[PDB]
Write a protein that binds this ligand. Structure first.
Ligand SMILES: Cc1cc2nc3c(=O)[nH]c(=O)nc-3n(C[C@H](O)[C@H](O)[C@H](O)COP(=O)(O)OP(=O)(O)OC[C@H]3O[C@@H](n4cnc5c(N)ncnc54)[C@H](O)[C@@H]3O)c2cc1C
Ligand SMILES: Cc1cc2nc3c(=O)[nH]c(=O)nc-3n(C[C@H](O)[C@H](O)[C@H](O)COP(=O)(O)OP(=O)(O)OC[C@H]3O[C@@H](n4cnc5c(N)ncnc54)[C@H](O)[C@@H]3O)c2cc1C
Ligand SMILES: NC(=O)C1=CN([C@@H]2O[C@H](COP(=O)(O)OP(=O)(O)OC[C@H]3O[C@@H](n4cnc5c(N)ncnc54)[C@H](O)[C@@H]3O)[C@@H](O)[C@H]2O)C=CC1
Ligand SMILES: NC(=O)C1=CN([C@@H]2O[C@H](COP(=O)(O)OP(=O)(O)OC[C@H]3O[C@@H](n4cnc5c(N)ncnc54)[C@H](O)[C@@H]3O)[C@@H](O)[C@H]2O)C=CC1
Lengths: 160, 160
């Protein structure tokens, strides 16, 4: 017995999350990234998160080529960035402010309140996606109200 | 206990808010087990598969591994007490919430959850002291409700 895809979409839509832009570099050195809601903590020993990226995506290809990626947590002013990095716009990085970290990884310096640089420590394919484990290597974090996505809409963390 | 490094990582991940589920199963002797879970993540639509990340040695992970199935109970904004009890030290948590047994046997938190998804374990991946559990969704029931949220070390309600 297996549920239908629409019922599953409706279920998962009702689990709201923060919003990241996951970034890396492709083999040509070109920044790549996507809006990502699948950031999940895996373990503290060593500090490891995971993301789940669509197979064939430019971002997964860059993550695999660089074996590292940055997780840029968006604050409430970052809705436009989240739209850019989930939509059909070309040259997404020309539409946001960004800087290259010491690692070379793209950091969204205006739209994110925190950025974690991760080394790819393993992957696991599941259907048409790949779970990517990231061992966190460097963190820069400031105060900010997190952007949220849930029930097919953007919102803001409701507490000061 | 945590190291300084691990604390910086907790500070980061705390700023990625999520909905809140209670993941339930039965142990080998039929006893209901469950825990508060913020690691619910969508993996793929083909077939519909989510994942959760459960601590190794937890009663819930042992039950999930025994029975190869589990329920994901998404809590609505009246469910804070259930989330607190299912994240605390008391093994008699099931006597402190109102619940019902699904036809399959899985525990359903009927008073505190607005949705329940019954899952078959389709794979696992150990990562440090945790196990990522892949759940192929077999059945979903859902009603309207405002999702409970957790972020920045606080409960809140979805604001829209
Ligand atoms: C709130 C939210 C959360 C999301 N979370 C996740 C998640 O956790 N995991 C995940 O895998 N995806 C997620 N997505 C979807 C993801 O952000 C988009 O699919 C994104 O476009 C992928 O970017 P990419 O460059 O890696 O992929 P590609 O599909 O390889 O796109 C490459 C480039 O082509 C352009 N492009 C974008 N979309 C299209 C299109 N439809 N047709 C043609 N060209 C296009 C853009 O310039 C893009 O950079 C999420 C989307 C939203 C809105
Ligand atoms: C907001 C929030 C989100 C969380 N998200 C996650 C998550 O995504 N993943 C995760 O792994 N944890 C998560 N936790 C932690 C998790 O909810 C707690 O660790 C929870 O108490 C685990 O329950 P358990 O019964 O499976 O674990 P256990 O630690 O096995 O048991 C809890 C208590 O019951 C006792 N006990 C266990 N089994 C038995 C038995 N057979 N007989 C007698 N006593 C027994 C234990 O000694 C302990 O005192 C989260 C906590 C919070 C607050
Ligand atoms: N690839 C992914 O993991 C995700 C992709 N998206 C995509 O973003 C767009 C908008 O999403 P919503 O506004 O939430 O409406 P929606 O109704 O399409 O999706 C609801 C929820 O279902 C899950 N989901 C949807 N498509 C998925 C996919 N292809 N793979 C895995 N899980 C998926 C996610 O939890 C998503 O938030 C859609 O194109 C959706 O596919 C959104 C979230 C996760
Ligand atoms: N085991 C898990 O995956 C999780 C466990 N918890 C438990 O609840 C407690 C309180 O959490 P918060 O109030 O958010 O404050 P916190 O500062 O203790 O934790 C902040 C965040 O760090 C991550 N994290 C913490 N402990 C973790 C662990 N053992 N494994 C993986 N990721 C972990 C989670 O994303 C958590 O929300 C944590 O200290 C922990 O015991 C909470 C979230 C997930």
């Amino acid at each position: 017995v297996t549920t239908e895809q629409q019922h599953y979409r409706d279920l998962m839509s009702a689990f709201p999350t923060g919003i990241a832009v996951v970034t890396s570099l492709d083999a040509q050195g070109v920044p790549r990234g996507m809006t990502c809601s699948s950031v999940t903590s895996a373990t503290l020993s060593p500090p490891t998160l995971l993301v789940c990226l669509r197979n064939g995506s430019a971002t997964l290809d860059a993550v695999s080529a660089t074996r590292g990626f940055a997780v840029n947590l968006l604050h409430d002013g970052g809705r436009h960035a989240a739209e850019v990095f989930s939509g059909p716009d070309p040259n997404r990085f020309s539409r946001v402010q960004w800087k290259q970290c010491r690692s070379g990884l793209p950091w969204l310096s205006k739209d994110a309140f925190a950025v974690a640089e991760c080394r790819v420590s393993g992957t696991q394919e599941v259907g048409d996606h790949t779970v990517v484990f990231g061992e966190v290597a460097r963190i820069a974090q400031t105060d900010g109200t997190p952007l949220l996505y849930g029930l097919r809409s953007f919102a803001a963390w409701p507490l000061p």
